[PDB]
């Protein structure tokens, strides 16, 4: 008769995004409300001023609430940060009456997640990877099948206990309930990935301001989750230091004229820059600016490439699919720079594409930017939370 709504909120380093979407019978999300606000009160270490973030959240909430003609009461909250980690466990149970029932599934996943976890961490996501019923490896939906012993591979995403307290207080002080805390990198791949790319094998890199969220899917299952604490802010620091310009201006010139490949930028495109110390403005070439951006971006993607390969090795020792036939998907705000899909192709030596949010309709023009990957992914994750 009506409409099922899902609202996602991302309190980022520079933007606070609130998205309102309808669940359609398709499985697509009809985005009917957008809310943007400059994220005031958050360092990269986290929240430094609660009252500022409360006004920021309710501002973004009020705009999307009015644009959608609804009443937001609960949200799906994103969560980024340095102290996010992962681990993989393996459980095994005797199959009840030699036919896999739901209680068989629930206990083997329970015995996998009931393990010692990284010092000062709690389980944020319990994601089963695949099941093995009597040496039929790689089973996704195993309920109903026959067998004696069943193995389950479960992927655990863990986070520090306190790293969410501030942003939960911020949202709760706006009269809103937190439906669930979602890892930002997880929601990102929910938005930019197709299901066949997970089957073929892919690696998503959510490139924000302070973190690079990396997820690796092989054989249709999430294999790895890694947070690298170096992103677009380190690139901005290079421009501010290599040219002697305020970081507020180094951020402007990077988004306005930056490029990850000095190979493709012309020699006659010249940019102007305000200098520090009240000293006269300087004039540099777009190519020279790209010659500063390229070494850092290459170094960052090599950190991801180094993480992909050593994971691929350990997967080879375990007899699990490992090849990334779908390639690399770079997403996030830091992935929107020119020439990046080409700079990454020289690093990973495979197909690279810049992914935007998928599977959406309505106000798609407002959230089609790769920086909206996490925000849209909160809508899809919450949609899957409903139908289940
Ligand atoms: N057109 C662009 N070119 C290069 N970098 C960009 C561009 N747009 C945004 N960025 C970078 O992306 C980062 C912000 O991405 P975002 O996903 O909003 O961060 P977070 O996930 O931490 O909130 C900033 O560091 C910014 O410099
Ligand atoms: Mg982002």
Residue numbers in the entry: 5 to 392
Excerpt from the publication:
The EcFtsA1-405 and XpFtsA1-396 structures showed single protofilaments with a “loose” longitudinal contact between the IIA and IIB subdomains.
